[PDB]
Amino acid sequence: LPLVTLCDGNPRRPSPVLRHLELLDEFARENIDSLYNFHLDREIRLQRLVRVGFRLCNSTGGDCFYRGYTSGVAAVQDWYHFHYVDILALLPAAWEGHFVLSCSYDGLDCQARQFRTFHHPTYGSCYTVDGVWTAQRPGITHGVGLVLRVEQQPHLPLLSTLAGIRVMVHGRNHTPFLGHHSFSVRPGTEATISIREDEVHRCTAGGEGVEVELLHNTSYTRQACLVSCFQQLMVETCSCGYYLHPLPAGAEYCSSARHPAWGHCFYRLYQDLETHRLPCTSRCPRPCRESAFKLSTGTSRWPSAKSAGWTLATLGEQGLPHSSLAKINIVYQELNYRSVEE
Amino acid sequence: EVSVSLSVGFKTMDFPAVTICNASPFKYSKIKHLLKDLDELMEAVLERILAPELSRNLNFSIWNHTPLVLIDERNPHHPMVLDLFGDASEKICNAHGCKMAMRLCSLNRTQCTFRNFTSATQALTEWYILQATNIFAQVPQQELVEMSYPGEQMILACLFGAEPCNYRNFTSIFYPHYGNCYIFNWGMTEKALPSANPGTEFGLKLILDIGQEDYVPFLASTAGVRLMLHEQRSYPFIRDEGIYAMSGTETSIGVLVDKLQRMGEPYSPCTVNGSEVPVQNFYSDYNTTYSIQACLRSCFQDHMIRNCNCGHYLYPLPRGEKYCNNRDFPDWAHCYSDLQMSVAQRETCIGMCKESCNDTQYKMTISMADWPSEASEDWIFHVLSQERDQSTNITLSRKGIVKLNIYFQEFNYRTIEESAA
Amino acid sequence: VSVSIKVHFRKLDFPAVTICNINPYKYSTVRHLLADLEQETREALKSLYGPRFSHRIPLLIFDQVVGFQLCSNDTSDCATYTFSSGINAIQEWYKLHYMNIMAQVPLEKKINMSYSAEELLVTCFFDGVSCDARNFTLFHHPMHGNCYTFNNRENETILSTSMGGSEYGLQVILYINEEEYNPFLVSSTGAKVIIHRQDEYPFVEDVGTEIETAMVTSIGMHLTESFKLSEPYSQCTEDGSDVPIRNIYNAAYSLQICLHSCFQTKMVEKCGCAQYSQPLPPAANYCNYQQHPNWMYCYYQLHRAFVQEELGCQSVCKEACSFKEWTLTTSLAQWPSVVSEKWLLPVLTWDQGRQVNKKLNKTDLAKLLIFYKDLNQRSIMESPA
Numbered sequence A: 001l002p003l004v005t006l007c008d009g010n011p012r013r014p015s016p017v018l019r020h021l022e023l024l025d026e027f028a029r030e031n032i033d034s035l036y037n038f039h040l041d042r043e044i045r046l047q048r049l050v051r052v053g054f055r056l057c058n059s060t061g062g063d064c065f066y067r068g069y070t071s072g073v074a075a076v077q078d079w080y081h082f083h084y085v086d087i088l089a090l091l092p093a094a095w096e097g098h099f100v101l102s103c104s105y106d107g108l109d110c111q112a113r114q115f116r117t118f119h120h121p122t123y124g125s126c127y128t129v130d131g132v133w134t135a136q137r138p139g140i141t142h143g144v145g146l147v148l149r150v151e152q153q154p155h156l157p158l159l160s161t162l163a164g165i166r167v168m169v170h171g172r173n174h175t176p177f178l179g180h181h182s183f184s185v186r187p188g189t190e191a192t193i194s195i196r197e198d199e200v201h202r203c204t205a206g207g208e209g210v211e212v213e214l215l216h217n218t219s220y221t222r223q224a225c226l227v228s229c230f231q232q233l234m235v236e237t238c239s240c241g242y243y244l245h246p247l248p249a250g251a252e253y254c255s256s257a258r259h260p261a262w263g264h265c266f267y268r269l270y271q272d273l274e275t276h277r278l279p280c281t282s283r284c285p286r287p288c289r290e291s292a293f294k295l296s297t298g299t300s301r302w303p304s305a306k307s308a309g310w311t312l313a314t315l316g317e318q319g320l321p322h323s324s325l326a327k328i329n330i331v332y333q334e335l336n337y338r339s340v341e342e
Numbered sequence B: 001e002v003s004v005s006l007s008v009g010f011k012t013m014d015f016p017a018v019t020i021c022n023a024s025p026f027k028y029s030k031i032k033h034l035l036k037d038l039d040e041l042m043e044a045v046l047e048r049i050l051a052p053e054l055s056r057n058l059n060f061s062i063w064n065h066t067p068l069v070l071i072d073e074r075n076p077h078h079p080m081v082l083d084l085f086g087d088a089s090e091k092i093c094n095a096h097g098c099k100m101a102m103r104l105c106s107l108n109r110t111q112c113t114f115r116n117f118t119s120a121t122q123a124l125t126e127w128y129i130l131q132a133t134n135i136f137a138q139v140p141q142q143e144l145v146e147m148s149y150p151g152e153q154m155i156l157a158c159l160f161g162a163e164p165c166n167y168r169n170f171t172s173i174f175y176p177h178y179g180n181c182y183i184f185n186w187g188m189t190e191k192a193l194p195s196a197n198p199g200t201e202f203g204l205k206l207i208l209d210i211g212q213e214d215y216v217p218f219l220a221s222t223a224g225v226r227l228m229l230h231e232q233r234s235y236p237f238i239r240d241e242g243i244y245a246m247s248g249t250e251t252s253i254g255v256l257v258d259k260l261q262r263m264g265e266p267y268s269p270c271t272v273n274g275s276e277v278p279v280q281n282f283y284s285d286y287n288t289t290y291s292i293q294a295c296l297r298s299c300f301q302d303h304m305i306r307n308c309n310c311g312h313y314l315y316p317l318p319r320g321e322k323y324c325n326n327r328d329f330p331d332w333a334h335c336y337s338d339l340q341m342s343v344a345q346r347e348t349c350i351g352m353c354k355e356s357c358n359d360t361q362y363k364m365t366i367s368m369a370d371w372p373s374e375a376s377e378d379w380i381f382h383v384l385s386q387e388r389d390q391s392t393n394i395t396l397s398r399k400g401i402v403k404l405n406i407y408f409q410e411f412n413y414r415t416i417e418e419s420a421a
Numbered sequence C: 001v002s003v004s005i006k007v008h009f010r011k012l013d014f015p016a017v018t019i020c021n022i023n024p025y026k027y028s029t030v031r032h033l034l035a036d037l038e039q040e041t042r043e044a045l046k047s048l049y050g051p052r053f054s055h056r057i058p059l060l061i062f063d064q065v066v067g068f069q070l071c072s073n074d075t076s077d078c079a080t081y082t083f084s085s086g087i088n089a090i091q092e093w094y095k096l097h098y099m100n101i102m103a104q105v106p107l108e109k110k111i112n113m114s115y116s117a118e119e120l121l122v123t124c125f126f127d128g129v130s131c132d133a134r135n136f137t138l139f140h141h142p143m144h145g146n147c148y149t150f151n152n153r154e155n156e157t158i159l160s161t162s163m164g165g166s167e168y169g170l171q172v173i174l175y176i177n178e179e180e181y182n183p184f185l186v187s188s189t190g191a192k193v194i195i196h197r198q199d200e201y202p203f204v205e206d207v208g209t210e211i212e213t214a215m216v217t218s219i220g221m222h223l224t225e226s227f228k229l230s231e232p233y234s235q236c237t238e239d240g241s242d243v244p245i246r247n248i249y250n251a252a253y254s255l256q257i258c259l260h261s262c263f264q265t266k267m268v269e270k271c272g273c274a275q276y277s278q279p280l281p282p283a284a285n286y287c288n289y290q291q292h293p294n295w296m297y298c299y300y301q302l303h304r305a306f307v308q309e310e311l312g313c314q315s316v317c318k319e320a321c322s323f324k325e326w327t328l329t330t331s332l333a334q335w336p337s338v339v340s341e342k343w344l345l346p347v348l349t350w351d352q353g354r355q356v357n358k359k360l361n362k363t364d365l366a367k368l369l370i371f372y373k374d375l376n377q378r379s380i381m382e383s384p385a
């Protein structure tokens, strides 16, 4: 039976770097406010030119190129994201209530203590429902129901600009972020997500055969092979790793404090992915048996105007500041998954 | 014998042609120099139904084309058929025995038939659509194409993969039910671009402006961008294939190309390229490929030209004919309603158009989130307002903006193919 | 054996569409039956966030963590539900007593306490001609009250469509009155919709989609049929002609109908009453306090057995040998637009006639379009050599 991961879209400001992120917020205001009406490199700066963008150069200056966009909404987003990545690699040594207000299954209660929790820099805090139980029947009373807080005010205003929970449905023993079947839920609604699984058999046989070595514990899958291959190219060309990917045992995450031209390196390799120059796609096969999840979703307003007096008390019971909530019903659509072959 | 082969997975290929239309056919601030008199009459019809006691010197030559009549049959031995104008309180009846209808006519109005509704909302909507069609069909298209939403206004930002994009990169067409429609990656005038990676990072990213404050109030009942995916060089039948995208919302559409290829006549009746079918296609001057809906919509126009001596507004027109309108063809409303409601016509055309051997389809997965979030609105809309590259209308409407992401899904390719045993 | 796939561009049969309001019963009515219970929910909530029903299922305190008992005559062993969210305890406990009250009310009065077709449907349209309450059959669902099914009445011909798109499918405007939702039952607002064969029972609660108000919800369809071979080649059944279980649903056989009817039969077999929220076997009565004071425990244990296949049902019920399914492609758009709202709402509140003199709110309406996206019908078929 497949799992589901919920991510809040609101990453933290880790205490070890709290001052540096304030420096970046100040710098970002100084820039946007110019284009329109302390280790961080203040010269990797936004420019109005493509119509707006930012330049990247070689370690001695010399060669340079611009990433440029039709609109500032894209340029500011990506530029701030680059500087955010440039900070988080500095500190710490990878060190570290919930947004799940309530959970239930078939009348039973459940809590965050029963989920598995982790973070990812661009998706925020994440929880895995990790159900070891077997689906009894179709219908909502036989799948989980979850009530979730969407943190509309304290979003980091430049890093990500969506209001809603991200849903990722995936198999057992998978990291959720690669090959993400990312569905999303608006605040103030109840989303009824029904899951159907398709499988295909024919390639790398569950990890047996040819591979490029992986950098995290998982079932083998093509996307993970591409990610580790990209990280290998990054590390072997520029002796540091990119932050949104796992880190080889002998590497360091890139930052201007030690790798003063890493942006040029990264975005040229990423352009090789944009134009599909990289060798990884030829190195990495599909699994010899594989499955994909297909979601059919209905949505409705929640809570009703008359029963809204309840969610106010559910927030008060948790003492939370404060429609702001969302609800997700997750249904396993049919006991009818079967393989496609020949 | 025929063997069914199949395959599924991911493959680099030409990204689907995407087409973008605003739900309103025209900008009310520009088209209202024609629709002034019809709107001045429509408001009076509404006042005659909703609050009669408030009920000047209207244009009844618009009304006498196809007047609405009240019909009430709650006195079975003697029904009363009653025109709303030219007439114990003053109320129109809405009871279970009351109906509302359009009195379509022909032959110096010596023969007539009623198109019949149970609800004033449908009656008024259909009456206004027919009257506005009569109005529009008299305007030359070279001018009518300039009273709808320019791409310069509507496509507010665009980005494919990481390559720049803007309005002049779309091929424009006038689709008479929707006004100007803009087609991306159509693959006709230039080579089409491929997409080699799955996920939104490598799809099409759009910000669009629905000018809701400027919709035609009696035509544009729905607010959104009408949206469709289709293969290169084919015509977008956006009326029945089209998705909607909602404003104030980031819509993400994951695409799976799901083809089915058949053999042809010695194993199945399909046609490979349409050179063989009995009926010529009036979409020839778009230079698009053959498709059965193009063939059906050319049956209908051919039979309209055959019966009424004019062609209807919603379809192309062979170079010799005229569009139906009340000045030249007084009987066109009745003559068109017959063909529209005749199921026998649909049957005899489906018996005349052979369907294509390549059944190609896009199995979209649609996802939505509120955009922009509360914390970012105040800078996103300032940025977008400050770079419209036009010197007018500074006030970018905050409740009219859409954002689209269209991308190839994790599995983007599925194909079924017939093969000879 | 072999498989082959055929495509017909042809005039199609239209499905049966079942529409429900998400609110079971118009609250201004059922108040006169539930006030006896809402006194006790109010007392409980005022105790946590400042007694006949509290005596039947006591609320318990577990050092705050709270829940309730589900216990039986040999009270040594019995079940309990306990909740980390104290207020969620009251929400679930109220749903418990609400269902045990409603399961006692006779069917013909209970129907009258819910929405009528003339009240739920503002306007209706199909292939260019109007429809009304006379074109929908009633369907009483024990949770959702009254649901109305299009294109399903007997001894008159099944509706069939010959043109593609929303202009020639079904489209309706639904009135979804947010003022009449039960205040004590936390729920969403909208309408449920499920698209099914005429001979198929609508498990609308389990399988149905949902509609959001102030939207035009368009549901374009393609029809996929598939057929496969019987027991000499693969295990399946033809309309229930060879299984030892009875379809109490009065509908054509399917795996779900077999599962649920087998469970209802076992349910009636032990402790003598039928589970509510499902149809009633021909010799049974719905479970309730007044007749079956321990019933929820003999349901709990039997349910725990079912999910582990220990009742045998899930081993002996079989898959149906052929089926249709409509691959829906749902979408939403804001309706009415800001400018059209001026005239459209007055006209709709006139089309409702007698029912309300005050204007409709944009949030009390929903519009629905159901149509064949194209006349192409996909048929997948298997046969032996």
Ligand SMILES: *[C@@H]1O[C@H](CO)[C@@H](O[C@@H]2O[C@H](CO)[C@@H](O[C@@H]3O[C@H](CO)[C@@H](O)[C@H](O)[C@@H]3O)[C@H](O)[C@H]2NC(C)=O)[C@H](O)[C@H]1NC(C)=O
Binding pocket: B037, B058, B059, B060, B061, B062, B138, B327
């Ligand atoms: C009701 O309104 C209709 C139109 O909605 C009025 O008809 C219009 O009458 C004017 C004046 O006769 C016509 O203008 C003509 O324009 C042509 C060039 O387009 C010009 O060559 C002529 O000298 C003249 O200016 C206009 O074509 C005509 N429109 C139509 C559709 O026939 C009518 O006057 C109004 N009737 C009543 C009863 O109020």
Ligand SMILES: *[C@@H]1O[C@H](CO)[C@@H](O)[C@H](O)[C@H]1NC(C)=O
Binding pocket: A173, A206, A207, A216, A217, A218, A219, A220
């Ligand atoms: C997942 O499967 C891999 C093999 O693909 C196995 O080595 C590993 O122990 C499993 N669990 C995790 C957490 O990776």
Ligand SMILES: *[C@@H]1O[C@H](CO)[C@@H](O)[C@H](O)[C@H]1NC(C)=O
Binding pocket: B271, B272, B273, B356, B357, B358
């Ligand atoms: C179908 O595709 C095949 C192979 O590309 C080609 O031979 C045939 O002309 C195509 N027909 C249409 C209608 O695209």
Ligand SMILES: *[C@@H]1O[C@H](CO)[C@@H](O)[C@H](O)[C@H]1NC(C)=O
Binding pocket: B272, B273, B274, B275
């Ligand atoms: C269409 O194909 C037919 C044979 O199938 C051929 O005779 C004809 O020349 C082709 N026409 C075009 C326009 O490709």
Ligand SMILES: *[C@@H]1O[C@H](CO)[C@@H](O)[C@H](O)[C@H]1NC(C)=O
Binding pocket: B284, B285, B286, B287
């Ligand atoms: C079709 O091609 C003809 C001849 O090249 C040209 O006159 C016409 O404008 C073209 N139309 C389109 C839509 O490309």
Ligand SMILES: *[C@@H]1O[C@H](CO)[C@@H](O)[C@H](O)[C@H]1NC(C)=O
Binding pocket: C111, C112, C113, C114, C115, C116
């Ligand atoms: C229920 O019946 C009562 C009278 O017995 C009537 O006042 C009420 O309108 C009825 N409601 C419905 C929905 O039939």
Ligand SMILES: *[C@@H]1O[C@H](CO)[C@@H](O)[C@H](O)[C@H]1NC(C)=O
Binding pocket: C272, C273, C283, C284, C285
């Ligand atoms: C159901 O109640 C009725 C009336 O008392 C009667 O048929 C019988 O007593 C009951 N049957 C069962 C199975 O409980």
